[PDB]
């Protein structure tokens, strides 16, 4: 009675799309994340899991960053971060991007489960809460939402 | 926690799309299902919860009907049915459809939770296992999958 794989197809109306795959060996163990994108402008783009798996009104209805530990916005590596903080996806000159990471806070089970929630890639770079701006400690000052998608359970 | 709201945006490459909204006021209470579709052929269309929230490969990876109680396919009102069996959506002459129902098998919490799974609307009518076809007791012989979507948690 525990999930070990999840998938997320991300679309929008900006010419940006991608797919994210998650695998979790144990109930509370780390989660391996792998995403692929196309149509992005060269550079870094904020990448986080939002609280709602609702995409009825673009990516706006997805709400804010999944934050069950009630912390401020940070980098994946920080102790003080939103469970949903996954940092930046890097796109090359061709507009394509490959993202890989192993995270210990997100999960496919329990209270920190992202199943049924949304992944969102932003237009600007996530300053990881260090930018010294108004939204730095809240969203990373990453701006608009290019694409998003609900996170669904994947086959064994 | 406990989820009281859920949503599912359904798309595909058959010109069919829709939005499903779920409401469960108490963790073990009945689930109110509301759905709207456009682009459908006049008549009935199988409407079920499939096991995987995997929509890649044009709904072909969604899996079989969500069947945790290991029973055969039936109508929503039958004592014998898959948890995921929600019957048929009825499209009017214009191709639009409105669906409303209260179900007691599906849930937004627990082992019968449909969060992170897929909603699928079919090409043809679900014979509710009364069609006399081998596929009747498995899929209702509803035909191809026109559109599907992952069930996500919604603001409550
Ligand atoms: Cu975000
Ligand atoms: Cu089905
Ligand atoms: Zn954050
Ligand atoms: Zn069924």
Curated annotation (Swiss-Prot), chains A, B:
Binds 1 copper ion per subunit. Disulfide bonds join 59-148. Destroys radicals which are normally produced within the cells and which are toxic to biological systems. Belongs to the Cu-Zn superoxide dismutase family. Its cofactor is Cu cation; Zn(2+). The lineage of its organism: Eukaryota, Metazoa, Spiralia, Lophotrochozoa, Platyhelminthes. InterPro entries: SOD-like_Cu/Zn_dom_sf, SOD_Cu/Zn_/chaperone, SOD_Cu/Zn_BS, SOD_Cu_Zn_dom. It catalyses: 2 superoxide + 2 H(+) = H2O2 + O2. This is Superoxide dismutase [Cu-Zn]. Keywords: Antioxidant, Copper, Cytoplasm, Disulfide bond, Metal-binding, Oxidoreductase, Zinc. GO terms for cellular component: cytoplasm. Homodimer. It comes from Schistosoma mansoni. It is found in: Cytoplasm. Its EC number is 1.15.1.1.
